Amino acid sequence: PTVEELYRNYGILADATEQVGQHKDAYQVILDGVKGGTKEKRLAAQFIPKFFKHFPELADSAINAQLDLCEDEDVSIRRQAIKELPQFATGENLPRVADILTQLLQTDDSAEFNLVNNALLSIFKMDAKGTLGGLFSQILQGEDIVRERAIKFLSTKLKTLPDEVLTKEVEELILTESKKVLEDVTGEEFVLFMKILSGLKSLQTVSGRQQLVELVAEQADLEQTFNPSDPDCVDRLLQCTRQAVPLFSQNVHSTRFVTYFCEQVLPNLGTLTTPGLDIQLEVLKLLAEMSSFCGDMEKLETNLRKLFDKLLEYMPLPKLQFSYVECLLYSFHQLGRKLPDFLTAKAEKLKDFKIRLQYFARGLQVYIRQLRLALQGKTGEALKTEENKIKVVALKITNNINVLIKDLFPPSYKSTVTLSWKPV
């Protein structure tokens, strides 16, 4: 088992060209290479895959030898052997190879990691479904560490594949397997699977997004009742509904999340958490984004009601909570469009509305004046001061409220504001 003899046998197999089949003996010498030392194992790792395709009568022995090198104590030997694994992924071996590579994702050596990723991508281009089979078997049946690595592989790598590879049938398989996985995922996995799925070209259509919204709803579990007490319910609902927001459009509606949020959430605030972002604002920002995408609500009036009431808790009677009011007012304004007959229809609580508005509008100016004063002469770099950024943002907030009040006057639902924390 020597390097001189490995080189000599390599030469024999290379120079034979057409007749390589007639030299099983030299190939055997090469496979014996794996029992040697470092330099010899390093050669076997290159030489076994190179001629593999010529010796079917030796195929199993070949893969087994390469796999021994893939679990070598020496990381550089493993690396050389892993780089070449896709060359064995021919005939009926691709599933077995795809399985091994997926395990190897757990390596902590970064160069190894990179090689394993690239090998997966290679076999992916040879046979996507066989490769996905390996990946998803591990995700479903393998060790936690492997399951995590496998999901991050789908999460980060599919996008680096050309469209040619990601056929309609492959995307269908990615959805089918994902739904199996989604029967039982942590929230962090959920987020990864939503990114994976929404990236699929076939799930980027109207019905594609409609399907995706339905998975979020299932995950979120909109038939449970809401418990404002423990966090096991709170951040899990927001993390979930967060994934649906980007899916919503004029044709893909938020109806169910809106209804749930109104009926089962607003009443429940504000019970809290630490820690240091404001959890009630987060909830209210979420509601306002989905509100513009609401469809035909069954429980419309009763819903618009609980919303109207949460509003008045922040628009007092003759220090204002502006950010909160931007959200609620925006939402109410979005849902009113559908039932103008509200307000017209309903009480003498409607003059108790006007009073609360007149008074807010008053406090608006003051605040707006103070902001515009603090901001003037300020030079564009000075605007970026995290302190000035907030002031700029607060002008969008306050000015947005003013437009919405100027609309709720025969009331109008004509005006369109861009939520302060959003781009145009």
Curated annotation (Swiss-Prot):
One of its GO terms (molecular function) is RNA binding. One of its GO terms (biological process) is negative regulation of apoptotic process. Residues 350-371 are annotated as: Leucine-zipper. It is found in: Nucleus; Cytoplasm. Residues 1-342 are annotated as: ARM-like and Heat-like helical repeats. Coiled coil: none annotated. The modification N6-acetyllysine is found at Q250. The modification Phosphothreonine is found at T379. Keywords: Acetylation, Apoptosis, Cytoplasm, Methylation, Nucleus, Phosphoprotein, Repeat. The keyword Nuclease does not apply. It comes from the Eukaryota. Expressed in all tissues tested, including heart, brain, placenta, lung, liver, skeletal muscle, kidney and pancreas. Highest levels in heart, pancreas and placenta. Highly expressed in several cancers. Preferentially expressed in squamous cell carcinoma versus adenocarcinoma in non-small cell lung cancer. One of its GO terms (cellular component) is membrane. Antiapoptotic factor that may have a role in protein assembly. Negatively regulates ACIN1. By binding to ACIN1, it suppresses ACIN1 cleavage from CASP3 and ACIN1-mediated DNA fragmentation. Also known to efficiently suppress E2F1-induced apoptosis. Its depletion enhances the cytotoxic action of the chemotherapeutic drugs. Belongs to the API5 family. Two regions, an N-terminal (aa 96-107) and a C-terminal (aa 274-311) are required for binding FGF2. Monomer. Interacts with FGF2 and ACIN1. This is Apoptosis inhibitor 5. It comes from Homo sapiens (Human). The gene is API5.
